[PDB]
Design a protein around this ligand. Sequence first.
Ligand SMILES: [Ca+2]
Ligand SMILES: [Ca+2]
Ligand SMILES: [Ca+2]
Ligand SMILES: [Ca+2]
Ligand SMILES: [Ca+2]
Lengths: 189, 189
Amino acid sequence: IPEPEVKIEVLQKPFICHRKTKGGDLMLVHYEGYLEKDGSLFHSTHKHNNGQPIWFTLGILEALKGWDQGLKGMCVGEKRKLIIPPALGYGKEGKGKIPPESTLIFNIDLLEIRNGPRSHESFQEMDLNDDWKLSKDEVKAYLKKEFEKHGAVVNESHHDALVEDIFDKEDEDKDGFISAREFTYKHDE
Amino acid sequence: LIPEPEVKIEVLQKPFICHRKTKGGDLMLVHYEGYLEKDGSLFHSTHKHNNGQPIWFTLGILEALKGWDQGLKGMCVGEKRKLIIPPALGYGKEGKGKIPPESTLIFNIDLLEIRNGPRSHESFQEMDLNDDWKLSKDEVKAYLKKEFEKHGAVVNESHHDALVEDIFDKEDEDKDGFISAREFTYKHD
Ligand SMILES: [Ca+2]
Ligand SMILES: [Ca+2]
Ligand SMILES: [Ca+2]
Ligand SMILES: [Ca+2]
Ligand SMILES: [Ca+2]
């Protein structure tokens, strides 16, 4: 358990949490940001953004390093305070209303989480022979290592059965493979 | 509001058979040589330092240079890449040590092995939806569901229920139906 550099305080949790944020997730948030020095408000989505919340992508340094460290494992309806030292904020030089070497205090409300499935990167990871289609063996191999990564035991019969059902559903033209197009475009109809 | 610079990747060698591709979180064992693009000078070689030990690098957590995270995804054991990394993705405007400011870097990197990353506190918290410091079967099922979906697989509940039992068979020891933080710590694999 590594030393946290941002102070995180959970102010409120939902009655029930169905999903927690992780790297790559888009987070719809309202927030207020204050300078710890004088308590002055530097930004509020409510006041400075026509009252609209904003989308933030977690875990890719889209914004402050402190947001990346402070907003993991968060649920819709959850509210968090972050106290962020300058090194994880705007550091020396600062920005806008934020002076150099400012510790920042955020009040952040999570309204929705989204993640877009089936990126090209995931396909390429699975396509071990780079032929732009996925074989049953390629899918089985991926499932095996993904389980084993987490130290989760692989029951081969359960996995073979899972693979068979995946292909029954996704292999639309029944050539035995899931092509790039069959991977990318999905319809239940 | 922001833009971005990119690494240039040139593949130098590919293995006849690729058994697994690198993905965020993996441990990569690599040899590398690093050069300044400016004058072509060698600043480091793993073949020369510490009696030729290759080095371990965790992909996708900014353990090292930004350009390494951008350039080493989807890589196979036996694959070699040349990364050309602009300063913003290397040691930046400041530079560091023997790397002068605003240095474009050239790395030739060979992948010797991929190993599973360790169980993290972060992963446990992400799964532990109700913050009771143990993972219910439903929480593990939820995690499986979202990860399956991310990779293009939406399958029948019977599959998830079966996979969860495989997992709990090993990880739930007192058989209270949960995987406590204690139980999660070591893959007893
Ligand atoms: Ca393939
Ligand atoms: Ca097909
Ligand atoms: Ca729990
Ligand atoms: Ca237990
Ligand atoms: Ca265990």
